[PDB]
Design an enzyme around this catalytic site. Structure first.
Site, PDB file in Angstrom:
ATOM      1  N   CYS A  17       0.718  -1.258   0.000  1.00  0.00           N
ATOM      2  CA  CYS A  17       0.000   0.000   0.000  1.00  0.00           C
ATOM      3  C   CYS A  17       0.748   1.312   0.000  1.00  0.00           C
ATOM      4  O   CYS A  17       1.598   1.595   0.855  1.00  0.00           O
ATOM      5  CB  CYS A  17      -1.044   0.006   1.111  1.00  0.00           C
ATOM      6  SG  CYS A  17      -2.588  -0.801   0.589  1.00  0.00           S
ATOM      7  N   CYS A  18       0.372   2.113  -0.994  1.00  0.00           N
ATOM      8  CA  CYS A  18       0.908   3.446  -1.237  1.00  0.00           C
ATOM      9  C   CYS A  18       2.406   3.468  -1.493  1.00  0.00           C
ATOM     10  O   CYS A  18       3.146   4.293  -0.971  1.00  0.00           O
ATOM     11  CB  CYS A  18       0.501   4.374  -0.087  1.00  0.00           C
ATOM     12  SG  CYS A  18      -1.287   4.850  -0.218  1.00  0.00           S
TER      13      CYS A  18
END
Lengths: 611, 611
Positions: A415-416
Site C-alpha cells: 500500500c501506497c
C-alpha cells in the site's frame, strides 16, 4: 533429501526443487481455474462461533475507541509470547501475536517515546523497566534518527512540507516471501542462508566493499537467527516446521507462521501478506484430488486463516490508530492476475479467499486486492463484481500494466508504494513531500505565513499583482532544489537508522541475499499545486497580501482547468511537477544506493480496441 | 562569560581560550622546575588512615585470588551507581566506580558470555534479567563479532597464530583528554561538540561520504550525551562541573571525574590516565603562590587522587586477572619530558606524583612512566633514580625519540601500543600475530602439529632431511600473505563491531572531532622466529617428523647467533620479518581506513655528541 520426497509428491519437477524459487514452483504445478463460484462451500459452525467470539472484541474496540488490551511490561519479539487462542479445539489454523486475541503488544525497537505516548493516551502505565531498557541499554530507531536529524529537517517536519516520515516506529512496506516457510521448511531455509552468509567470505577477506560486506554478513546472521526463533514460536503451538509442509493444512499454517513472526517483531503499516491464494491452491487442490480433505474443510482453513489476518493489531495512539486518521494494518493479499505465458493465475482458492467476505462477512482488513486483467475468466470477473456489490470490500489494480511492467507474474501489492516482485525487492518507505506547501513557501520567500515561520531559505515574496506563472515556477523550481535535499537527507538518515536499530530480520530472512532497494518517494498536495499553477496561468490571480506582503488568499478572475478532469493543461502541470522533483531528487546520494522511485503518478500508452 | 573570567584568574592569554587546546594552555602558563625533592611533604594522617582502610581490601584480594565483591544485577553506565566512599569525611578527592571500594561492576556491552564466565568462576549467579537484556534486546560487542567471524579466523584463534584478540570485552588503549573537563568545564565542551555536530551538516545534505557522515554524527550525539551524564555523575558526589575548575582541588577533581566516567562505562586494558602531572601543577602552583593551599595540602590531594587510581578494578576471570596472562589496569601517567621549545616539562607536581610511592608506599598500578630525556633537570634525574631504587615502581620511555618523532610535546603513553598525541589520536588495538607459529606451520604444510589441525591453506610439508633458509623463508613468505589477510580481516570485524556496540563515548567526547585512527598491530614470538631462522642458515637443522611428515621437533648441529645479543645476523632477520609482515598487511583494506602500525620493533638513526 528425506522429507522433501514425502511432501513434494505429485509436484512437477523444476528449478524450485533445487534453489528457493517459489515462482517456478507455482508456475510448474498450480491449476488455473475458469470455473465459477458454484463449487464454493459456506461457513462452518466452528468458524462462525469463533468469528462471533472475536466480533465481541471488535465491538469493544469501536465502542471504546481504544485497544481491547495491551502489554505494559513485555517487549515483544518472535518468541516472547506464549501460545494464545480464541478457542483451542475450534481453530483449524492457529497463531496470535500475544496470548490474548486483539491484545496489542509493545514493539520497543522502533522507539520508546511512542510507547509512552500510547500508555499515556489509553491511560495505563509503562513498566519503568521496559523504559529503562530501551533508553539506557538498547537504543531505539526513533532516538537514533533524532540524534542525527538536522535543525532544518526538524523544521520542515514542523511545517508539514515533509510529512508521514517513519521515524517513530515501523517503516514497513516489506513483503517477506512467507510461502517459503511452507514450500521449503525452516531447516532448508536456514541452510540456504548459511550458503548466502558463506558466499560473502571472499569479498570480506579481499576488502571488496569491506564495511558493506560486514553489514550484509551480520544482517544474514540475524536472518538465520530469526528463522530459528520462528521454529521455537511455532513449537509453542505444538508445531514443528523444520521440514516442508506435507498437506494443505501445514502449507497454510506454515505460511501464516512466517507472517506471524513478522507481525510479532515489527510494527510497520504495509506488511502485505503477499501473493498467497494461488500458491496455497496447489496444496489444497492436491489434498482434494486425493480425498484427504473436503471442499468445505478447505474453505474452513482459509476462513480461519484470513480470520487471524483480520485480527492483527498494533498499539498506536489516537492519531496513528486506524480509527481517527492512522494508516490501517495492510495485510494485503494479491489475487489472480495472468502469468507471462498467458495462462490465468486465478484458481479455486482465489474464489475461496473472496468467499471469506460471505462466510465471515465483509471486512476491510484482510485487504484483498484483485490483480485485474482483461483476460481473467468471466466467471471470476462476474464474481468479483458480485462480491464487490455485496461487500464492497475488494480492491483492484491493473495487472495488464504491472505484469508486463515488471515482466514478472509473481509480484505483490504494498500500500501506497510501488509493487514488488516477492522476495526480490526491498522498498524503503519514504513519506510524502508536500508540493502544495512548497509552492506557497516559494511564493512567500520561504516563510509559512499561517504559522509565521521561516521554513525554507530566506528570499523575497513574489512582488507585484496577478501572479506570473513563469516567475512562480522559477521560484518554485529553486525551492524544490532545497526541498529535495532536505527530503532525501531525512530519508537517508531514517533508513540507515531503521536498518541498524530495527532490521526486519524475520522478513528479510525470507528475501534473497541481494535485494533491489529503492527509495519509495511520495508527494502530497499535487492536485492542489497543479490547480494553483493552472489558475496562475489561465486566470487573473491577484495575490492578497498582508502587513508584511505574504500571499494570504487569492482572487481568480477567469476560469482554469482543474485536476481530475483529464484536461492536459493541468494533468500536464501535475506531470511536469512530479518529474521536476524526481529529477532533482535522483541527482542526490541515497543511503545504500536505493534508487528513488515514486508511485503517485504513473504515465503510459495503451491501445484500446473498439467494435 | 563570568565562569571562565574568574576561573582563568591570572592565566596567560592564548589560543587555548577560544578553542579546546589544552596543549597551548600548558605551554602558555606552567612552571618548569629544576629544583630538588627537598620541598616535598610527607603523607597525611587522613591519607594514611584511608590507604590502610583500602589495603584491607587489597590483602583480601591477594589472599582470595578473587574480587572483593562484584555486581550480579546492575549494568554499569556512567550514572548507574550512587556515590561511594572509603571515608566520606577524610577524602580530599572523591569518586569510585561502584558504591563500595574495590567492588567491581558489570560492563555488559563488551559481551555477556564473559560476565557469565566471571559469575561462574568466582562462584556467584548472574541475575537472569541482565542476561536477558544483553541477549535479546541489546546485542553485545562479542556476539556481534562472532556473528561475522569466518571459520578460518576461528581456527587461527584456537591454534594461537592470532592471539589476544579484543573480542570478548574492552579493546581500550584509548586516552581521552581528561584535563579538558577541568580546563573548560562540561558546558563549554558540550557546546563545542554541538559545533562539531553542526559542522557535519553540509556533508550530510550534500551526500559527501553519506554513511560515514551519518555515523560521525550519531557518534557525536552520543559524546554530547555522555558529557551530560558526566555532570549527573559528578552531581551525585556533591559537585557541579558544568563550569571550569577554579582552584587546584577542582582542577584535580574535574580531571579525575572525566576519567571516572571512562572507568565506569568501559573496561579496556590500557585506558591511560594521560599526561596530567605538569598540567595540574599550573593549578597547584597558582594556589600556592596565593596562600590558598599548603604544599602538604597539595601532596594530599595528589595522594588521594592517585589513591583512587590505585583502586580502579575490572571484573575478569582467572585466566585474565592481572596475575596470569591477565593484562593489568594500565592507568598510565606520563611524566616530565621536554617541550619542543627546549624548556623542560618537569614540574613540582612531577616530584609530587613520584612522591606517592613514599607517602602511600610502592604501587605498580598507577603505572607512572617517566618521559626521559638527556636534558631533564639533574635533581629530577637523581630523584627518579632514587625512587626507582627504593620502590622499583617507575617506568621510563625515551622522550628524545618520541618528542621529535611526533614533533609534539603533548603525547601520552598507552601500554603495548604506539604513543598518542592526547586527544588527537585514536588507536584500534590489534592483538598479536604469532610469527613463530606461522613459521612452523609454513614448514609443516599449514598443519599445527600440536593440535593436529589444518589452519592455513593445505600444502606439502617441506621435503628433505636438512632445512634450507631460502626455501623456509619462501614458504614463510607465502604463508605470511595468508596470515595477513586473516589477521586484518579479524581486526576489521572486531573494530567495526566495537564501534557499534561499545563506542567509548565518554572518552571520545574528550577527543577532537576528526581523530587519526591507526590499526595498532602486534607480533608474538618474534625472537623465537628470528632464532629459528638464524639456526637454519648458520647451522645444520634436521627435522624430526611424525606419521604425516610434519616437523615435530628439530636437531641442531653447531652454533647459531642468538637474538638479543647484538649479533646483527639474527637481529636483521627480526627486522626483515617485521617489515615483511607490515608490508603485507599495509596492502589490505582496513576498517575506517585506520593505517596499520606496529610498536614491537622500532628503528632509529641516532646521533650522539662526544666530549
Amino acid at each position: 533429501n528425506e522429507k522433501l520426497a514425502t511432501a513434494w509428491e505429485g509436484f512437477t519437477k523444476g528449478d524450485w526443487q533445487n534453489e528457493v524459487n517459489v515462482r517456478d514452483f507455482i508456475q510448474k504445478n498450480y491449476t488455473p481455474y475458469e470455473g465459477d463460484e458454484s463449487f464454493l462451500a459456506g461457513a462452518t459452525e466452528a468458524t462462525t462461533t469463533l468469528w462471533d467470539k472475536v466480533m465481541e472484541g471488535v465491538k469493544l474496540e469501536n465502542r471504546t475507541h481504544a485497544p481491547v488490551d495491551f502489554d505494559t511490561a513485555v517487549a515483544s519479539t518472535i518468541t516472547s509470547h506464549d501460545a494464545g487462542y480464541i478457542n483451542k479445539q475450534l481453530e483449524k489454523i492457529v497463531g496470535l501475536q500475544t496470548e490474548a486475541p486483539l491484545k496489542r503488544a509493545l514493539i520497543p525497537f522502533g522507539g520508546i517515546k511512542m510507547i509512552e505516548g500510547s500508555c499515556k493516551a489509553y491511560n495505563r502505565e509503562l513498566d519503568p523497566m521496559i523504559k529503562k531498557i530501551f533508553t539506557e541499554y538498547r537504543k531505539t530507531h526513533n532516538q537514533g534518527v533524532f540524534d542525527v536529524y538536522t535543525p532544518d529537517i526538524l523544521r520542515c517536519r514542523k511545517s508539514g512540507v515533509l510529512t508521514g516520515l517513519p521515524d517513530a516506529y515501523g517503516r514497513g512496506r516489506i513483503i517477506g516471501d512467507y510461502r517459503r516457510v511452507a514450500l521449503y521448511g525452516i531447516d532448508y531455509l536456514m541452510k540456504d542462508k548459511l550458503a548466502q552468509f558463506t558466499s560473502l567470505q571472499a569479498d570480506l577477506e579481499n576488502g571488496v566493499n569491506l564495511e558493506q560486506t560486514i553489514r550484509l554478513r551480520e544482517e544474514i546472521a540475524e536472518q538465520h537467527r530469526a528463522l530459528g526463533q520462528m521454529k521455537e514460536m511455532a513449537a509453542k503451538y505444538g508445531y514443528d516446521i523444520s521440514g516442508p509442509a506435507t498437506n494443505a493444512q501445514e502449507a497454510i499454517q506454515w505460511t501464516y507462521f512466517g507472517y506471524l513472526a513478522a507481525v510479532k517483531s515489527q510494527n510497520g503499516a504495509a506488511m502485505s501478506f503477499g501473493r498467497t491464494s494461488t500458491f496455497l491452491d496447489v496444496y489444497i487442490e492436491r489434498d482434494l484430488k486425493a480425498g484427504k480433505i473436503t471442499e468445505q474443510e478447505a474453505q474452513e482453513m482459509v476462513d480461519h486463516l484470513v480470520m487471524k489476518l483480520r485480527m492483527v493489531r498494533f498499539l498506536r495512539t489516537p492519531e496513528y490508530d486506524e480509527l481517527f486518521s492512522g494508516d490501517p494494518i495492510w495485510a494485503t493479499e494479491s489475487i489472480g492476475g495472468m502469468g507471462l505465458d498467458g495462462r490465468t493465475l486465478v484458481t479455486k482458492n482465489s474464489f475461496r479467499f473472496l468467499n471469506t467476505l460471505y462466510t465471515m462477512g465483509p471486512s476491510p482488513e484482510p485487504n484483498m486486492t484483485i490483480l485485474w486483467s482483461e483476460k481473467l475468466p468471466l466467471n471470476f470477473k462476474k464474481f468479483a463484481a458480485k462480491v464487490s456489490i455485496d461487500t464492497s470490500s475488494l480492491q483492484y489494480e491493473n495487472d495488464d500494466l504491472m505484469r508486463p511492467d515488471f515482466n514478472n507474474d509473481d509480484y505483490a501489492i504494498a500500500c501506497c508504494v510501488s509493487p514488488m516482485i516477492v522476495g526480490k525487492q526491498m522498498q524503503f518507505f519514504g513519506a510524502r513531500a508536500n508540493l502544495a506547501k512548497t509552492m506557497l513557501y516559494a511564493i512567500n520567500g520561504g516563510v509559512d505565513e499561517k504559522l509565521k515561520m521561516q521554513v525554507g531559505p530566506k528570499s523575497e515574496p513574489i512582488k507585484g499583482d496577478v501572479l506570473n506563472y513563469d516567475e512562480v515556477m522559477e521560484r518554485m523550481d529553486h525551492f524544490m532544489d532545497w526541498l529535495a535535499k532536505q527530503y532525501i537527507t531525512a530519508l537517508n538518515i531514517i533508513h540507515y537508522m531503521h536498518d541498524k536499530y530495527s532490521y526486519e530480520a524475520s522478513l528479510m530472512a525470507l528475501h534473497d541475499r541481494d535485494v533491489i532497494r529503492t527509495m519509495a518517494c511520495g508527494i502530497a498536495g499535487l492536485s492542489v499545486a497543479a490547480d494553483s499553477l493552472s489558475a496562475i496561468k489561465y486566470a487573473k490571480v491577484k495575490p492578497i497580501r498582508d502587513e508584511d506582503g505574504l500571499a494570504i488568499d487569492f482572487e481568480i478572475e477567469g476560469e482554469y482547468p482543474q485536476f481530475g478532469n483529464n484536461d492536459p493543461r493541468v494533468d500536464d502541470l501535475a506531470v511536469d511537477l512530479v518529474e521536476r522533483f524526481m529529477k532533482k531528487i535522483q541527482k542526490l546520494h541515497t543511503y545504500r544506493d536505493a534508487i528513488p522511485t515514486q508511485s503517485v503518478l504513473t504515465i503510459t500508452s495503451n491501445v484500446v480496441y473498439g467494435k
